[PDB]
Amino acid sequence: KEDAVPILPRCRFTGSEIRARDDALPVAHVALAVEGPGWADPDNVVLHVANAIIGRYDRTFGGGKHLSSRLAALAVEHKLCHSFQTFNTSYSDTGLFGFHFVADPLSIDDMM
Amino acid sequence: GRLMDRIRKWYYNAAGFNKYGLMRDDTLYEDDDVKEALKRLPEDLYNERMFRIKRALDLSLKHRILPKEQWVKYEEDKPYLEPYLKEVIRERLEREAWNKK
Amino acid sequence: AEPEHDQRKRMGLKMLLISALLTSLLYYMKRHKWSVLKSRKMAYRPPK
Amino acid sequence: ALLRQAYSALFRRTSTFALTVVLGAVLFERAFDQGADAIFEHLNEGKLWKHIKHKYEASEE
Numbered sequence A: 001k002e003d004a005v006p007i008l009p010r011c012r013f014t015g016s017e018i019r020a021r022d023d024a025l026p027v028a029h030v031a032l033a034v035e036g037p038g039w040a041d042p043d044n045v046v047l048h049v050a051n052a053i054i055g056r057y058d059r060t061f062g063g064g065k066h067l068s069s070r071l072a073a074l075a076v077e078h079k080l081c082h083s084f085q086t087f088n089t090s091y092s093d094t095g096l097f098g099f100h101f102v103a104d105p106l107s108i109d110d111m112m
Numbered sequence B: 001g002r003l004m005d006r007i008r009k010w011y012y013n014a015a016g017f018n019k020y021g022l023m024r025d026d027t028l029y030e031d032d033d034v035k036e037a038l039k040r041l042p043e044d045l046y047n048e049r050m051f052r053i054k055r056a057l058d059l060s061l062k063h064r065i066l067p068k069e070q071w072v073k074y075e076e077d078k079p080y081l082e083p084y085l086k087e088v089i090r091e092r093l094e095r096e097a098w099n100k101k
Numbered sequence C: 001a002e003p004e005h006d007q008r009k010r011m012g013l014k015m016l017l018i019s020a021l022l023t024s025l026l027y028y029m030k031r032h033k034w035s036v037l038k039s040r041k042m043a044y045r046p047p048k
Numbered sequence D: 001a002l003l004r005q006a007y008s009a010l011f012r013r014t015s016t017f018a019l020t021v022v023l024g025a026v027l028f029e030r031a032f033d034q035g036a037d038a039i040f041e042h043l044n045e046g047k048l049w050k051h052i053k054h055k056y057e058a059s060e061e
């Protein structure tokens, strides 16, 4: 028993949402994600490549409107958000593949 | 004797907004006076009202009501706005009266 | 008075079946979409 | 599992979904009409011209 590495019970993923609203907060945060494959899977290499295409942004990227990332460009051209990031968080048997952005209350919809 | 009180408490239950967990003042039609009063409510009272109302709209869409235990009881209904509203109206009538003179 | 009599009823039959089928189908779809709001749960969490 | 097969083959790609509706309609019509007419006539045995037609259809004068 002592030298056997325990296998954890699998965690079920659920398409769903949680909305914590506080209009008193200056900017909104939003994160969206689908279930990832988990450490072992090779596809993670492709997912990471994919995340690189979309990439990330933040109001201090000097590249501005000429950034290669389309989402970054639009973000700049339309002042869509303060920042955004893609991610591929892995775990043993699962993971989260998504993105998170910070935007002003009135640009959330266009950003999304 | 306690007739007026028997009637009120009766109407209160007949109305039934207490089944949605709403306070009498939660059910007021928001005309101008009521809108001004609401702007004067302290933050906590305003957020409590907002949750109560949102909660009622959700029950309403679901076609459910709160469990009998959670119903607002006649004597525990807090007339949180009536005070502000009466003041708002007092001010209005003062100005109206004054602008005629 | 009404030569269409037979065709009218044959049509009525078709209208009913399709009506029964289509109505059920649409009922499910309305329900499906609304399920999101129907089962939705909320809570009031003030810094209290 | 048909549901999964259906999903993968028909309902996943919006293009195949439309194709399934069209081809689905074409087959539904052919079937649905035949059945309706069939039901209607059975419920009206010997009342329609289709039924009595033979009596004068090349068997008189």
Ligand SMILES: CCCCCCCCO[C@@H]1O[C@H](CO)[C@@H](O)[C@H](O)[C@H]1O
Pocket: C007, C010, C011, C014, C015, C018, C019, C022
């Ligand atoms: C709710 C939608 C109802 C639409 C029902 C469409 C059915 C009409 O079907 C009709 O049946 C008649 C009798 O066979 C035929 O003569 C007509 O050509 C045909 O169009």
